[PDB]
Design a protein around this nucleic acid. Structure first.
Ligand SMILES: [K+]
Ligand SMILES: [K+]
Ligand SMILES: [K+]
Ligand SMILES: [K+]
Ligand SMILES: [K+]
Ligand SMILES: [K+]
Ligand SMILES: [K+]
Ligand SMILES: [K+]
Ligand SMILES: [Mg+2]
Ligand SMILES: [Mg+2]
Ligand SMILES: [Mg+2]
Ligand SMILES: [Mg+2]
Ligand SMILES: [Mg+2]
Ligand SMILES: [Mg+2]
Ligand SMILES: [Mg+2]
Ligand SMILES: [Mg+2]
Ligand SMILES: [Mg+2]
Ligand SMILES: [Mg+2]
Ligand SMILES: [Mg+2]
Ligand SMILES: [Mg+2]
Ligand SMILES: [Mg+2]
Ligand SMILES: [Mg+2]
Ligand SMILES: [Mg+2]
Ligand SMILES: [Zn+2]
Lengths: 91, 102, 74, 211, 55, 141, 136, 43
RNA sequence: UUGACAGACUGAGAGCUCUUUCUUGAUUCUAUGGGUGGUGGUGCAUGGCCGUUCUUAGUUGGUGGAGCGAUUUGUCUGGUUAAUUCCGUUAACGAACGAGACCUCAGCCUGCUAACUAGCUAUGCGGAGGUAUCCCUUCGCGGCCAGCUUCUUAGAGGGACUACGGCCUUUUAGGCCGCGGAAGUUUGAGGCAAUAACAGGUCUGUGAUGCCCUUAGAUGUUCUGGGCCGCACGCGCGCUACACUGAUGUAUUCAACGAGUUUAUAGCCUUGGCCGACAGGCCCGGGUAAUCUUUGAAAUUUCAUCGUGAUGGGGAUAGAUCAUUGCAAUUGUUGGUCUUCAACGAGGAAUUCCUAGUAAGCGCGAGUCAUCAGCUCGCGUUGACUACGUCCCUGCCCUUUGUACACACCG
């Protein structure tokens, strides 16, 4: 899916800073409740991350639940150019 | 430094609500405070009647689902600090306690 | 109809067997005795057992009753 | 500022949704159930499982992730909802745990009869008055059939069922279709109430021994 | 599709503006007390929600 | 010390309470004389407790009756029951027990409902029909 | 002797006659053309229906002192036939009630209750009581 | 005027003012009844 | 590789596409695998759920007894019960399910606890009437130091056990009648509800699901429009009637179960005031609720008109016109005003439900709901006739007996 660079940066930043993220299955929602990006782009970016094992996806009662993995943490650290010391708030 | 403190207790379990009301009343009495109540409001019976079948086949049978909400009112004539101390006692789950003035 | 089930009959028989000394021919005193000397989950069951025990005591006063073994009678 | 009716209904809906979310997330980890306790400016959620090591993870990373995602999804105030993992006492007396164990055994290729008999024996050796396990679906053939395993006491009618019977239902996704597993465990009277109902059966009369 | 066309039809009311919060189906929604669950999902989750059958 | 009693009559959902106290013998319902009670046809039921005991026995008590709930017939029945019970109680508590027993026997010999409430109530309706027992019309073809 | 001690029908007739004789009422021009409610099929049979309605409304206000226009619409409503569909309750005309209340207020029989609605004045109590007393 | 399948042709006349364009483009074909089929009677 | 001004194209301020050429920057495009979605097929591949067999009383081990065995006894001649409920008889003895017990609602408590979000009583003041001071009747307002809980609410308990009396019955289990009692059909009504089954329904409730189909010119998704409602006809559940035990117009006055807001000028229930014939509109406000809507129905009661005339019964059909909901009302959304005034005069063969606060009549609340109830789920008001028996019809349970049936007589 075509995603603006700023939107992808914001999504990745939020995911790494928090380590978890949810999303209601609403493709046409204007903005994600926690992220300024539209809901569809957040859902599809998380699906892309899950497809290559960067995140774990759980679905229940029309909602998504994404949890970052070690490979996902490494990818986000490399891509965001953050120092190795900084880690997701969950740890 | 005396005020009519209003305490409203709501719960789905009669036993826990009654025990909490009794504990609050005994705590207020132990401090020589004036207690009015507990006043039992009429029970609220939420009712939902839905068809048993997940489809349209068979005899139309219905499930009567009720959720009962019990509410109690207690009035104490004392200051805010003493009522706050009294309400600090342990409260079992399922009982909601709200404290207000008048 | 009003036919006492197996539970009521067995409870009345055992209670009379074990506490014949304190039994009376009055239903209310019998139900108080049952409350004292037995654990009955329901008040209705306690009342039924007390009534059948009173009936059994009335029968026993006349003479022997099959299924009840009283030490004094034997 | 909503009415009491809507408040209680929302509380029930939140409990149901949280239970479903935990069941979906903690399937393999084992999830007997959850309990929600509400306190002034603090809500406590306790997770019951047979394997709390998996639920917590290493240094509580998994439980922290669950707490964060629950707080974000349910709009809870930060540092206001916290999760706890507790051991389930007598897991053999929990219908959900036994159903999950049977699901795991069946998914591993174990024969249905052997797994069901083992579950029944484990339940009975755990102090259960009785138990019943039903397996339904396509077993050994394209024609669906039901398998019933039973031992001990069991009641099915009246009010005491709601307290003396613990039951669960689970689906197993096999290669050729879904398998339906039902676990029904009859508890035993417990004066303390920890391991069973604190009420005797309606038709149980006990006579104290005379002096 | 075009932003002004894709999903542009108003959905402020009617069965198409509401769905089951559990399964997302738009049919047989129980709106009483704010449950917003379809009758099947509600009948499945009634015990957890706190609804009891007395008669 | 005031000399008064308060007895209630019941019929379906109708509840009537009679306030009986020492007085000149007036009977009023909701501030209206008992002679104007509606419907006019049920005035006989309303007056039955008085027509059996005669007006003289009511000559020393003031009766004020408040009624609520139910319908037009149930309210009348509850009112008459309350009047009977209130008079019986007043005679029991402030008059010789012998006269109280006499009036109670006179009232009971005519109709037992004058002092004992009728326990009949509406039966809840069951799904599958419009009424408690009536079921929907069945068709086979 | 007060209104409570007389039959409502006889008192209504007497008070309607008294109100008509008073001459202080100003009947609207549409009294002879309007029905008393949407649920009615025909206009009132009695040419003096306005005075009778005013007397009944005054008696109601005398008994209870917090009634408004909607309350009187409910009081004088009833079943509405719908042809081949079942009947349901229907409210009565509100303009008639408002006009009658205003006219009664103009005569000092009722005034505005502080809590809302209308309340009987002392003059109204005296007038109704005298009318009831003269009925005998 | 589209009727769901085709654009029906009309010319606006003075007598049609204050009417909807739907009123002059019938969306259904008027029914002409053929002989009843199997299962019409014996119900 | 995206987006887009203008013109054309288009149902269309869809750059959808074309002409004209600007912007953007590896996020995509092309191809191969692999996915994803599908109210797509398969309920005769399935899970779960529900209905039915089946509202009846029925069902199964262990150890013993019988049989070569399938099987059988237990689980029964009899009496009794709503009951495989009991008493008993007994090659059976002990048990486990169903039934009962259980739990919810209703019916009694002048006995307990407690009520300014419920009331009563007396008092103080005030209005009205009566002899008008004092007295009597009726209304309105305050007393958190006036009293109290009969009336209302809801917690704990009590209460019925056929307890007692007369008969019948095996000195049993039990049954009929009767005083008393709130209650003597299991007090009434429900919820729950066994073993074994159906190729009964549901893949169109489910991010339940196997396999098959499709997967970009899509069976995915979205937008516009239409249809699901189309009308020679047949059938099912219903609403309105055929009238005077009535219709209409006045006057009159008695419920219960319930439901209600994002406060934004304001969203839900809406009081009060004003405007209007109605439908509706405007303005102050109350209620997240025993606090406000809620001071909360009709049938009915009461007095007049009508007068046996398809008539002032009936309200189908249709014309004109006015409002409200909605983005949109045409194929009338619904609701008002005037006008039109069809069949129908009690309904053939057939056929449904029902035994007491029941049937029937009467209305009310909720679900669906922006707007629409002749439907369903509940609620109350008025309130009956007949029977309290039987196996004739239609079926069900048990026993005996016949069978060439076992897909089980639709054999
Ligand atoms: K099935
Ligand atoms: K055997
Ligand atoms: K499928
Ligand atoms: K659905
Ligand atoms: K027969
Ligand atoms: K039988
Ligand atoms: K033969
Ligand atoms: K045979
Ligand atoms: Mg049982
Ligand atoms: Mg039962
Ligand atoms: Mg589709
Ligand atoms: Mg099937
Ligand atoms: Mg054997
Ligand atoms: Mg056998
Ligand atoms: Mg009381
Ligand atoms: Mg089939
Ligand atoms: Mg259709
Ligand atoms: Mg039907
Ligand atoms: Mg009323
Ligand atoms: Mg006519
Ligand atoms: Mg007519
Ligand atoms: Mg419609
Ligand atoms: Mg429908
Ligand atoms: Zn659902």
């Amino acid at each position: 899916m075509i995603i603006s660079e700023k939107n992808r940066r914001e999504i990745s930043k939020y995911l790494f800073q928090e380590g978890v993220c949810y999303a209601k299955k609403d493709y046409n929602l204007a903005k994600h409740p926690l992220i300024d990006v539209p809901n569809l782009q957040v859902i599809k970016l998380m699906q892309s991350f899950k497809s290559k094992e960067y995140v774990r996806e759980t679905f229940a009662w029309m909602h998504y639940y994404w949890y970052l993995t070690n490979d996902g943490i490494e990818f986000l650290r490399t891509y965001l150019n953050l120092p190795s010391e900084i880690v997701p708030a969950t740890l | 430094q005396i005020h009519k403190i209003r305490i409203t207790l709501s719960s789905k379990n009669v036993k826990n609500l009654e025990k909490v009301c009794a504990d609050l009343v005994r705590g207020a009495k132990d401090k020589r405070l004036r207690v009015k109540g507990p006043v039992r409001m009429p029970t609220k019976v939420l009712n939902i009647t839905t068809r048993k079948s997940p489809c349209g086949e068979g005899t139309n049978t219905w499930d009567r689902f009720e959720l009962r909400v019990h509410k109690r009112v207690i009035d104490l004539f004392s200051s805010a600090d003493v009522v706050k101390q009294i309400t600090s006692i342990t409260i079992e789950p399922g009982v909601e306690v709200e404290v207000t003035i008048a | 109809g009003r036919v006492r089930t197996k539970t009521v009959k067995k409870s009345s028989r055992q209670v009379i067997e074990r506490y014949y000394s304190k039994m009376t021919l009055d239903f209310h005193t019998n139900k108080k005795i049952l409350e004292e000397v037995a654990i009955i989950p329901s008040k209705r069951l306690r009342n039924k057992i007390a009534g059948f025990s009173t009936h059994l005591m009335k029968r026993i006063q006349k003479g022997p009753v099959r299924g009840i073994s009283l030490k004094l009678q034997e | 500022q909503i009415s009491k009716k809507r408040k209680f209904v929302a509380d029930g809906v939140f409990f149901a949704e949280l239970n479903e979310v935990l069941t979906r997330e903690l399937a393999e980890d084992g999830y007997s159930g959850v309990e929600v306790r509400v306190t002034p400016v603090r809500t406590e959620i306790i997770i019951r499982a047979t394997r709390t090591q998996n639920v917590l993870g290493e240094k509580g990373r998994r439980i922290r992730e669950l707490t964060s995602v629950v707080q974000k999804r349910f709009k809870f105030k930060e540092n206001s909802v916290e999760l706890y993992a507790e051991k389930v006492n007598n897991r053999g007396l929990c219908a959900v745990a036994q159903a999950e164990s049977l699901r795991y055994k069946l998914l591993g290729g174990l024969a249905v009869r052997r797994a069901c008999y083992g579950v029944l024996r484990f339940i009975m050796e755990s102090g259960a008055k009785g138990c019943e396990v039903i397996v339904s679906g396509k077993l050994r053939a394209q024609r669906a059939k039901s398998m019933k395993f039973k031992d001990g006491y069991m009641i099915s009618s009246g009010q005491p069922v709601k307290e003396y019977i613990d039951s669960a239902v689970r689906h197993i996704l096999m290669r050729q279709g879904v398998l339906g597993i039902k676990v029904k465990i009859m508890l035993d009277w417990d004066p303390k109430g920890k391991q069973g109902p604190t009420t005797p059966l309606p038709d149980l009369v006990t006579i104290h021994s005379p002096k | 599709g075009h932003s002004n066309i894709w999903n542009a039809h108003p959905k402020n009311y009617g069965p198409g503006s509401r769905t089951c919060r559990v399964c997302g189906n738009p049919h047989a929604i129980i709106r009483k007390y704010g449950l917003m669950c379809c009758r099947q999902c509600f009948r499945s989750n009634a015990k957890e929600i706190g609804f009891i059958k007395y008669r | 010390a005031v000399e008064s009693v308060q007895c209630f009559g019941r019929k379906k959902t109708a509840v009537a309470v009679t306030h009986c106290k020492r007085g000149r013998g007036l009977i009023k319902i909701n501030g209206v004389p008992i002679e104007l009670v509606q419907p006019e046809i049920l005035r006989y039921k309303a007056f039955e407790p008085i027509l059996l005991l005669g007006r003289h026995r009511f000559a020393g008590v003031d009766m004020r009756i408040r009624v609520k709930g139910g319908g037009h017939t149930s309210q009348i029945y509850a009112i008459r029951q309350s009047i009977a019970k209130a008079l019986v109680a007043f005679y029991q508590k402030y008059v010789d027990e012998q006269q109280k027993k006499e009036i109670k026997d006179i009232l009971v010999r005519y109709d037992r409902t004058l002092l004992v409430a009728d326990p009949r109530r509406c039966e809840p309706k069951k799904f599958g029909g419009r009424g408690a027992r009536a079921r929907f019309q069945k068709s086979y073809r | 002797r007060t209104v409570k001690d007389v039959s409502p029908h006889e008192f209504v007739k007497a008070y309607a006659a008294h109100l008509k004789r008073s001459g202080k009422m100003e009947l609207p021009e549409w009294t002879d053309i309007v029905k008393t409610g949407k649920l009615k099929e025909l206009a009132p049979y009695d040419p003096d229906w306005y005075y009778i309605r005013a007397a009944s409304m005054a008696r109601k206000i005398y008994l209870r002192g917090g009634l408004g226009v909607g309350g009187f619409r409910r009081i004088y409503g009833g079943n509405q036939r719908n042809g081949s569909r079942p009947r349901h309750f229907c409210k009565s005309s509100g303009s008639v009630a408002r006009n009658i209340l205003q006219q009664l207020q103009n005569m000092n029989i009722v005034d505005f209750d502080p809590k809302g609605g209308r309340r009987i004045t002392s003059n109204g109590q005296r007038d109704l009581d005298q009318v009831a007393g003269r009925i005998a | 005027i589209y009727n769901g399948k085709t654009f029906n042709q009309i010319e606006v006349k003075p007598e049609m003012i204050s009417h909807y364009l739907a009123e002059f483009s019938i969306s259904y074909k008027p029914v002409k009844h053929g002989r009843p089929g199997i299962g019409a009677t014996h119900s």
